[PDB]
Design a binder for this molecule. Structure first.
Ligand SMILES: O=c1cc(N2CCOCC2)oc2c(-c3ccc4c(c3)OCCO4)cccc12
Ligand SMILES: [Cl-]
Ligand code: NA
Length: 111
């Protein structure tokens, strides 16, 4: 639809909801493989993404299309499912956030 209305919705509705969720705090800033002691993070994960980057991108008019911003969200979730083992707590927190993301996206404006 209208790119501006869609991106405002991603920022004002989708992102604000996910940012304030009780599972959000591991994703407000980039993964720090050193401090977490993740030796092979940047080996296995080639496109790191966090909610802080997406937020800054939305606020700086980085995106040309809602689907770009949606792709960055998806990369953040996908990175988490890939680097981690199926039963780590972060996997379930990412899954919880991602479902809300898809719920919200189903109500994105088209004009
Ligand atoms: O995919 C990820 C990989 C890991 N791992 C570390 C431990 O969990 C297993 C593997 O953490 C991530 C974190 C994270 C950030 C800060 C933390 C945290 C986790 O845990 C408590 C202490 O502050 C955030 C986003 C993605 C991942
Ligand atoms: Cl954790
Ligand atoms: Na948990």
């Amino acid at each position: 639809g209208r790119v501006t209305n869609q991106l405002q919705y991603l920022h004002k509705v989708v992102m604000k909801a996910l940012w304030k969720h009780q599972f959000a705090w591991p994703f407000r800033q980039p993964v720090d493989a050193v401090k977490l002691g993740l030796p092979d993070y940047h080996k296995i994960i080639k496109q790191p993404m966090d909610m802080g980057t997406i937020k800054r991108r939305l606020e700086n008019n980085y995106y040309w299309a809602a689907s770009e911003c949606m792709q960055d969200f998806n990369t953040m979730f996908t990175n988490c499912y890939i680097y981690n083992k199926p039963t780590d707590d972060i996997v379930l927190m990412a899954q919880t956030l991602e479902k809300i993301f898809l719920q919200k996206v189903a109500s994105m404006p088209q004009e």
